[PDB]
Amino acid sequence: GSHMSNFQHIGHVGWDPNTGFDLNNLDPELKNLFDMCGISEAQLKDRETSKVIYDFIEKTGGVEAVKNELRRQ
Amino acid sequence: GTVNFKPSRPAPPPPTSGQASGASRPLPPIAQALKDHLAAYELSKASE
Protein backbone atom coordinates (compact mmCIF):
# COMPACT_ATOMS: atom_id res chain seq x y z
CA GLY A 1 0.00 0.00 0.00
CA SER A 2 1.60 3.24 1.31
CA HIS A 3 5.18 3.73 2.67
CA MET A 4 5.86 4.34 6.43
CA SER A 5 6.52 8.04 7.39
CA ASN A 6 9.31 7.10 9.90
CA PHE A 7 12.19 8.00 7.43
CA GLN A 8 11.91 11.70 8.51
CA HIS A 9 15.44 11.50 10.12
CA ILE A 10 16.84 9.72 6.96
CA GLY A 11 16.04 10.24 3.16
CA HIS A 12 15.23 8.62 -0.21
CA VAL A 13 17.28 5.36 -0.37
CA GLY A 14 16.90 1.99 -2.20
CA TRP A 15 18.61 0.09 0.70
CA ASP A 16 17.08 -2.86 2.67
CA PRO A 17 18.48 -4.89 5.69
CA ASN A 18 17.80 -8.18 3.80
CA THR A 19 19.80 -7.71 0.51
CA GLY A 20 21.39 -4.23 0.77
CA PHE A 21 21.39 -1.35 -1.76
CA ASP A 22 19.02 -2.23 -4.67
CA LEU A 23 21.17 -0.79 -7.52
CA ASN A 24 18.01 -0.51 -9.73
CA ASN A 25 16.42 1.97 -7.19
CA LEU A 26 19.75 3.31 -5.79
CA ASP A 27 20.31 7.07 -6.07
CA PRO A 28 23.24 8.69 -7.95
CA GLU A 29 24.47 10.72 -4.91
CA LEU A 30 24.70 7.40 -3.02
CA LYS A 31 26.73 5.61 -5.76
CA ASN A 32 29.00 8.71 -5.84
CA LEU A 33 29.78 8.66 -2.10
CA PHE A 34 30.36 4.89 -2.16
CA ASP A 35 32.80 4.93 -5.16
CA MET A 36 35.07 7.53 -3.44
CA CYS A 37 34.94 5.21 -0.36
CA GLY A 38 36.05 2.30 -2.67
CA ILE A 39 32.87 0.15 -2.33
CA SER A 40 31.96 -2.46 -5.04
CA GLU A 41 28.51 -3.93 -6.06
CA ALA A 42 29.45 -7.14 -4.15
CA GLN A 43 29.69 -5.02 -0.95
CA LEU A 44 26.53 -2.93 -1.73
CA LYS A 45 24.60 -6.24 -2.21
CA ASP A 46 26.19 -7.70 0.93
CA ARG A 47 23.30 -7.36 3.47
CA GLU A 48 26.03 -7.41 6.19
CA THR A 49 28.43 -4.78 4.65
CA SER A 50 25.69 -2.57 3.11
CA LYS A 51 24.16 -2.33 6.65
CA VAL A 52 27.44 -0.83 7.99
CA ILE A 53 27.54 1.59 5.01
CA TYR A 54 23.85 2.58 5.49
CA ASP A 55 24.16 2.92 9.34
CA PHE A 56 26.51 5.86 8.67
CA ILE A 57 23.97 7.57 6.32
CA GLU A 58 20.88 7.42 8.65
CA LYS A 59 23.33 8.63 11.41
CA THR A 60 24.44 11.92 9.80
CA GLY A 61 20.84 12.72 8.76
CA GLY A 62 20.19 10.46 5.71
CA VAL A 63 20.83 10.86 1.96
CA GLU A 64 20.25 14.64 2.35
CA ALA A 65 22.87 15.10 5.12
CA VAL A 66 25.63 13.22 3.26
CA LYS A 67 24.79 15.35 0.12
CA ASN A 68 25.11 18.65 2.03
CA GLU A 69 28.68 17.66 3.08
CA LEU A 70 29.54 16.02 -0.32
CA ARG A 71 28.65 19.39 -1.99
CA ARG A 72 31.73 20.97 -0.23
CA GLN A 73 33.81 19.45 -3.12
CA GLY B 1 11.36 56.24 -19.70
CA THR B 2 11.89 59.52 -17.77
CA VAL B 3 11.14 59.08 -14.00
CA ASN B 4 11.20 61.44 -10.93
CA PHE B 5 11.04 58.83 -8.09
CA LYS B 6 10.16 55.16 -7.20
CA PRO B 7 10.99 53.11 -10.39
CA SER B 8 9.42 49.99 -8.69
CA ARG B 9 11.10 47.53 -11.21
CA PRO B 10 12.62 44.04 -10.46
CA ALA B 11 16.18 43.00 -11.50
CA PRO B 12 18.06 39.77 -12.54
CA PRO B 13 21.13 38.60 -10.49
CA PRO B 14 24.62 40.10 -11.34
CA PRO B 15 26.56 38.37 -14.22
CA THR B 16 29.08 35.59 -13.20
CA SER B 17 28.27 36.16 -9.44
CA GLY B 18 27.10 32.50 -9.17
CA GLN B 19 30.47 30.67 -8.98
CA ALA B 20 30.46 26.83 -9.26
CA SER B 21 32.58 23.69 -8.62
CA GLY B 22 34.76 22.08 -11.36
CA ALA B 23 38.37 21.33 -10.17
CA SER B 24 39.53 17.62 -9.91
CA ARG B 25 39.84 17.84 -6.04
CA PRO B 26 40.03 14.76 -3.68
CA LEU B 27 37.08 13.23 -1.73
CA PRO B 28 34.93 15.13 0.88
CA PRO B 29 35.52 14.42 4.62
CA ILE B 30 31.97 12.90 4.94
CA ALA B 31 33.25 10.20 2.53
CA GLN B 32 36.49 10.01 4.56
CA ALA B 33 34.36 9.37 7.70
CA LEU B 34 32.40 6.61 5.84
CA LYS B 35 35.79 4.98 4.91
CA ASP B 36 36.81 5.11 8.63
CA HIS B 37 33.35 3.83 9.76
CA LEU B 38 33.44 0.86 7.30
CA ALA B 39 37.05 0.19 8.44
CA ALA B 40 35.71 -0.38 12.01
CA TYR B 41 33.75 -3.28 10.45
CA GLU B 42 36.60 -4.69 8.25
CA LEU B 43 39.09 -4.67 11.18
CA SER B 44 36.50 -6.47 13.38
CA LYS B 45 36.39 -9.42 10.90
CA ALA B 46 40.06 -10.04 11.90
CA SER B 47 39.59 -9.27 15.67
CA GLU B 48 37.49 -10.06 18.83
Which chain B residues contact residue A52 at CB under 8 A? 37-38, 40-41
CA distance B40 to B35: 9
Question: For residue A59, what are the CA distances in angstroms to A2, A24, A49, B26?
Answer: 25, 24, 16, 23
DSSP structural state of residue A5: G
Question: What is the span of the domain harbouring residue A27?
Answer: 5-70
Technique used by the depositors: NMR
Question: Are residues A36 and B37, on separate chains, in Cβ contact within 8 Å?
Answer: no
Nearest CA in chain A to B36: A37
Contacts of A41 (CB under 8 A, 6+ apart): A23
Instruction: Return the amino acid letter for B43.
Output: L
Angle at B44 between CA A32 and CA A60, to 5 degrees: 40
Closest CA to B33 of A55, A13, A31, A45: A55
Contacts of B4 (CB under 8 A, 6+ apart): none
A9 φ/ψ angles, rounded to the nearest 5 degrees = -100, 10
Distance from CA of B11 to the nearest CA of A (A): 28
DSSP structural state of residue B34: H
Q: Is the dihedral of CA A27, A29, A35, A39 positive or negative?
A: negative
Question: Are residues A70 and B25, on separate chains, in Cβ contact within 8 Å?
Answer: no
Question: Are residues B41 and A37, on separate chains, in Cβ contact within 8 Å?
Answer: no
CA distance A38 to A54: 15
Find the CATH number of the domain harbouring A52: 3.90.810.10
CA distance A8 to A11: 7
Report how many domains make up chain A: 1
Question: For residue B4, what are the CA distances in angstroms to B1, B7, B8?
Answer: 10, 8, 12
